[PDB]
Amino acid sequence: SLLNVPAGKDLPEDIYVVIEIPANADPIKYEIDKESGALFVDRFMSTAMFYPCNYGYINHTLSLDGDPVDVLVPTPYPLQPGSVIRCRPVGVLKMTDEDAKLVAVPHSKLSKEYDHIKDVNDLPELLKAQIAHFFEHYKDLEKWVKVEGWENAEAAKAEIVASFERAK
Amino acid sequence: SLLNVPAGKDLPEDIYVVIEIPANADPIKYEIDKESGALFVDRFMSTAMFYPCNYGYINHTLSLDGDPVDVLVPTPYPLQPGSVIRCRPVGVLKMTDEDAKLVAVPHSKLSKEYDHIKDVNDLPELLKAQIAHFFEHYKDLEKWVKVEGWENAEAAKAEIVASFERAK
Amino acid sequence: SLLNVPAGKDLPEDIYVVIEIPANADPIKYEIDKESGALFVDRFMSTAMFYPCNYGYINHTLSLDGDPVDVLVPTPYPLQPGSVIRCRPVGVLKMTDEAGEDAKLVAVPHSKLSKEYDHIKDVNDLPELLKAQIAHFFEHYKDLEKGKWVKVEGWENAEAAKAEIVASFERAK
Amino acid sequence: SLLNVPAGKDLPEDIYVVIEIPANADPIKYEIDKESGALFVDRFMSTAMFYPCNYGYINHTLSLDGDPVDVLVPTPYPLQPGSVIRCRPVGVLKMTDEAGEDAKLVAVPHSKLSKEYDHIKDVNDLPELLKAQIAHFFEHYKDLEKGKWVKVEGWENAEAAKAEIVASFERAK
Amino acid sequence: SLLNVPAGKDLPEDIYVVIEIPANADPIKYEIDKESGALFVDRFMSTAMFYPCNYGYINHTLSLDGDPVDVLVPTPYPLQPGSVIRCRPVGVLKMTDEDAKLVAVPHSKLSKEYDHIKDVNDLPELLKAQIAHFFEHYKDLEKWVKVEGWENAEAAKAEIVASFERAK
Amino acid sequence: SLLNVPAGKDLPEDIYVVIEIPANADPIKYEIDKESGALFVDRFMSTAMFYPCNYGYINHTLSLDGDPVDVLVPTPYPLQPGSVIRCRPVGVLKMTDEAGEDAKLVAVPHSKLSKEYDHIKDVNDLPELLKAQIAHFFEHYKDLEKGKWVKVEGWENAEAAKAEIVASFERAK
Ligand SMILES: [Mg+2]
Ligand SMILES: [Mg+2]
Ligand SMILES: [Mg+2]
Ligand SMILES: [Mg+2]
Ligand SMILES: [Mg+2]
Ligand SMILES: [Mg+2]
Ligand SMILES: [Mg+2]
Ligand SMILES: [Mg+2]
Ligand SMILES: [Mg+2]
């Protein structure tokens, strides 16, 4: 089951992200039920918006807000909900609703299209702008958010370590 | 696994439906293998028809025909096969092939678009007509069905209780 | 060609809307080129949003913004860009952008194409959620565009909508 | 424009079919408007069915029902509404509806677009399942329409199909 | 879980194939992680090619190359990744990278559209040509393959028996 | 009609490309018929491949192969066949097939439709992977066609691309 997926091959550099929401999909917010490991429908988003990246989490992590570390992962093609992808963290969007969303890109073994993206600054400015705007507005018709800013790979990695250790 | 999903938060008012067939999809009839909990292909439908609603069942229920209680769940967007959705029952299409198909709509927490639908009579007449016609004709090129009529929330709820208790 | 499509069967009650952008599609803003009648890519939207309804225009109309009357049309399923749909107007979303005033009509499929909308006779009959999504979209789809802004001002009834159609049709003559 | 598309390269063996509805699509019945050549939404089908094949017509043909010859064309993948495909006729589904008689031709992609259909020379070569689905669809797609009914009467060969094409082409002159 | 799916109802005649890659899909190569049974992203294919058939494996089999027996399964419609389909083997494409890919078609109970295909020779020549060409070229932009030839149902069945027994 | 679409706003820097085949689509090779302007199905590709980019042409151009200049255009999302996109050329893939010489231009969306490509000024700025996929595709998409072969010869810069456009435009006059 998805419940048995490890946090990564080598934390915080090499991680696995369990995808819950594909990039560019219908506005259905799914979530893996932590008890069953099954894909539950969390809610039908009320805004006409879509996640600009595949969205999911790192298993075996516990942040402050209670859940696992949530990650956005850009890919050439939308991924299947419930699928697991190997990535390396490169940044973190910090916001207040405080919450942190990491940005991880596919591991070199899955694709070479991202090798050049080592840090938050290497991410296409538009994409960063879209992620922010999305997080800043998807819940408008409901819960609110306030994007504070981006942080580097180090801070993204620190969040992973802290949450994994905190999960233990 | 899907095998561990509960019948609902509060039977028969608040239930979880394990989706096997998405609304408006290619004519592939999937079914969750009860032993493995895996999605098996039951058959490739022979008619050029598609389920007008997402189709699935309530876990931990056993009707007479042997299976779990089967449910149709309208949603704004097609759901993923194997996904689980929280709903509240509102009616039942009774037919003879006797079989009963409940109609459940998304729980208020997932969407407010259905709050006004409390009973079978609140369902759009077209949709009810489509569900009937579909059930009445999808197996024409194979097994036959004869739609007898709709029943209220109470009867739909009674079917859930009877099947859950019968499952115990 | 799309350029020859009439404004409607009986304006302003019965109109045709030329679809340029389907509902729930990828963020590509298409626009029918006025001279060729061909579907041009106006731009790739910068926000992660999608039109909540099919969006197009009534041909042979000229609003004061120099363009045809814009119309949003909800349909059970997304339509093909470049297709024409028979509708009857039911409301208008009034707004102000960086250029000035703008209005978007909301029209529903005519009774002969579908009965599902027969009960929607006016702006008030539209699901509140739908109205909310349309407003939120227009209010935010251009947020990532330097120098562009939208201020939704409110909705207006069928009568106001029909008024826009006649004025613009006459104005286009 | 689609209005200028020829009936075919060499009628009735080699024809072009203007596609209006793709195979396995959402239940939206499109129709090319005869005067504009534009794709109009004829209606949103009320049943949970979809055309088992791409459906369109041969341009410049006039059958006695006042419309062009209707043709169903199976293809490996669904075609774009408004596209034209070169086919060769292989059969005709004869039926009677509430208005009277109707016939739908079944044509397959010409050998130059694909070799996959070279072995389908006549109505009997079509997979029985495909023939069954087409009949069932026409027999049931209008079930939720008050006052509409279809009674499939049977299939006919390539020769009968080609006969329909020539008669209607000549008839359209 | 998918890990508990049996090899088939009756080996080597009646088997179950666990689908990992749907036919005609985006070039994402998924694979079921053998430890968790979860769908992992193996890699984003670099060529602009797509599997001409649904691709997966027979569970509880171990070939030489180490994995389970991999199967291509033509269907009227693309199948869901992680879904299981009942088929009967009809041929095997042998190649060297040595590797063997079986071709199985849906079991008669799921569809009758394939009853007439009993052996490798009954498969549409184009499809066989497409499978070969695909296998011969998908890894060009990376690992190489050399299609050697097709073999009959018997050889396909022999491969299943050998791998199942070898898996024990 | 598509036949009336101009070659561009300011050739060879600013051009329009009429899309015939979208990126990452089913293997159906569409082609705009030169006389009708309608989208014809040229053929169903025999290989399990798909165009890595949207593919079309610049109207009003005539290369020595007797056809308009072919252009591949990467876009964030696949475009509708028959739509026109404003681009600026950045390179050309030179190749030789069974008929002789051929060249495919690579153009990117103009700055006004999207800023995402502003940094792509020349063939060298294109992602190497993209260049590799395009070459591999043209080199293999016709492998299952008896008597057809492609030999990619190399890439050339913006200048060479712009040269192709002017020569062909002038040549089409
Ligand atoms: Mg959090
Ligand atoms: Mg039952
Ligand atoms: Mg979308
Ligand atoms: Mg305006
Ligand atoms: Mg469908
Ligand atoms: Mg007729
Ligand atoms: Mg192997
Ligand atoms: Mg594809
Ligand atoms: Mg050329």
Residue of A4, A20, A73, A108 to mutate, interface with E, max E Cβ within 10 Å = A4
Query: C51: nearest CA in chain A?
Result: A48
The annotation status of E99 as a binding-site residue, yes or no, is yes
Decide if A38 and B84 are in contact by the 8 Å CB cutoff: yes
- CB of D132 less than 8 A from some CB of B: yes
If we measure between CA atoms, which residue out of E108, E125, E140 comes closest to residue E52? E125
The annotation status of A109 as a binding-site residue, yes or no, is no
The annotation status of E65 as a binding-site residue, yes or no, is yes
Is residue F8 a contact partner of residue F1, using CB atoms and an 8 Å limit?
Answer: no
Contacts of E133 in chain F (CB under 8 A): 47-48, 140, 143-144
Contacts of A41 (CB under 8 A, 6+ apart): A28, A29, A30, B75, B79, B83, B84, B85, B86, B106, B110
Residue B57 CB burial class (10 angstroms; 0-12, 13-18, ≥19): buried
- CB of B39 less than 8 A from some CB of A: no
Decide if C49 and A52 are in contact by the 8 Å CB cutoff: no
Q: How many CA within 13 A on the CB side of residue D160?
A: 14
Report which secondary-structure segment, H or E, holds F57: strand F54-57
Contacts of F127 in chain A (CB under 8 A): 113
As a CATH number, domain F1-173 is: 3.90.80.10
Is residue B12 a contact partner of residue B104, using CB atoms and an 8 Å limit?
Answer: no
Tokens of E12: 């080597």
Is residue B155 a contact partner of residue B49, using CB atoms and an 8 Å limit?
Answer: no
Is residue C111 a contact partner of residue D146, using CB atoms and an 8 Å limit?
Answer: no
Is residue A43 a contact partner of residue A29, using CB atoms and an 8 Å limit?
Answer: yes
Report which secondary-structure segment, H or E, holds A133: helix A125-137
**What experimental approach yielded this model?**
X-ray
Tokens of D18: 């203007």
Q: Does CATH number 3.10.510.20 belong to domain A1-168?
A: no
What is the rounded CA–CA span in Å between residue D173 and residue A87? 66
- CB of D36 less than 8 A from some CB of C: yes
Neighbours of chain F (3+ CB pairs under 8 A): A, C, D, E
Choose among E1, E30, E44: nearest Cβ to A75.
E44
Choose among F28, F38, F81: nearest Cβ to D5.
F38
Tokens of D132: 């069954």
Q: How far is CA E17 from the centre of its chain?
A: 8
Decide if A39 and B80 are in contact by the 8 Å CB cutoff: yes
Report which secondary-structure segment, H or E, holds E149: strand E146-151
What is the rounded CA–CA span in Å between residue A83 and residue E80? 12
If we measure between CA atoms, which residue out of E39, E25, E111 comes closest to residue E75? E111
Phi, psi of E20, rounded to the nearest 5 degrees: -115, -35
- CB of A128 less than 8 A from some CB of C: no
What is the rounded CA–CA span in Å between residue E116 and residue F137? 35
Residue B114 CB burial class (10 angstroms; 0-12, 13-18, ≥19): buried
What is the rounded CA–CA span in Å between residue A127 and residue A51? 11
Other CB atoms closer than 10 Å to residue E68's CB: what's the count? 22
If we measure between CA atoms, which residue out of E48, E133, E26, E142 comes closest to residue F133? E48
Strand partners, D28: D44
The annotation status of E10 as a binding-site residue, yes or no, is no
Decide if A30 and B80 are in contact by the 8 Å CB cutoff: yes
The annotation status of F117 as a binding-site residue, yes or no, is no
**Cβ–Cβ pairs < 8 A, chains B and D:** 51
Q: How far is D97 from chain C (nearest CA, A)?
A: 19
Other CB atoms closer than 10 Å to residue F80's CB: what's the count? 19
Distance A138 CA to ligand 3 centre (A): 14
Residue at D69: amino acid letter: V
Q: How many CA within 13 A on the CB side of residue D155?
A: 18
- CB of B125 less than 8 A from some CB of E: no
Distance C71 CA to ligand 4 centre (A): 9
Query: C143: nearest CA in chain A?
Result: A133
Tokens of D28: 């939206």
The one-character DSSP state at D2 is: G
Q: How far is CA B142 from the centre of its chain?
A: 22
Q: How far is E122 from chain F (nearest CA, A)?
A: 19
The one-character DSSP state at A68 is: P
Choose among E5, E83, E106: nearest Cβ to B30.
E83
Decide if B129 and D140 are in contact by the 8 Å CB cutoff: no
| Structural gaps in chain D: residues followed by a C–N separation over 2.5 Å | none
Strand partners, A96: A146
A residues 14-33 closer than 8 Å to E (CB): 16, 18
The annotation status of E143 as a binding-site residue, yes or no, is no
- Kindly report the CA angle at B75 between B73 and B78, in degrees rounded to 5? 100
What is the rounded CA–CA span in Å between residue D143 and residue D165? 29
Tokens of C169: 């049709």
Distance B64 CA to ligand 2 centre (A): 7
Q: Are strands C83-97 and D39-44 parallel, antiparallel or unpaired?
A: parallel
Distance C157 CA to ligand 4 centre (A): 17
Contacts of E124 in chain D (CB under 8 A): 116
Residue C73 CB burial class (10 angstroms; 0-12, 13-18, ≥19): buried
Q: Which residues of D106-144 are buried (b: 16+ CB within 10 A; e: fewer)?
A: bbbbbeebbebbeebeebeebeebbbebbbbbbbbbbbb
Distance B92 CA to ligand 2 centre (A): 11
Contacts of D30 in chain C (CB under 8 A): 80, 83
Helix, strand or coil for residue E57? strand
Contacts of D144 in chain B (CB under 8 A): 126, 129-130, 133
If we measure between CA atoms, which residue out of B37, B104, B22 comes closest to residue B69? B104
What is the rounded CA–CA span in Å between residue B84 and residue E97? 42
Positive or negative, the Cα torsion across C72, C76, C82, C88? negative
Positive or negative, the Cα torsion across B84, B89, B91, B92? positive
Other CB atoms closer than 10 Å to residue D14's CB: what's the count? 16
Contacts of E75 in chain B (CB under 8 A): 28, 41, 44
**Torsion angle of C-alpha atoms B21, B25, B27, B30, degrees rounded to 10:** -20
The annotation status of E67 as a binding-site residue, yes or no, is no
How many residues does this entry show for chain B? 168
What is the rounded CA–CA span in Å between residue E69 and residue E94? 12
Contacts of A161 (CB under 8 A, 6+ apart): A11, A12
Decide if C81 and F85 are in contact by the 8 Å CB cutoff: no
**Cβ–Cβ pairs < 8 A, chains A and B:** 59
Contacts of D85 in chain F (CB under 8 A): 40-41
Q: How far is F147 from chain C (nearest CA, A)?
A: 36
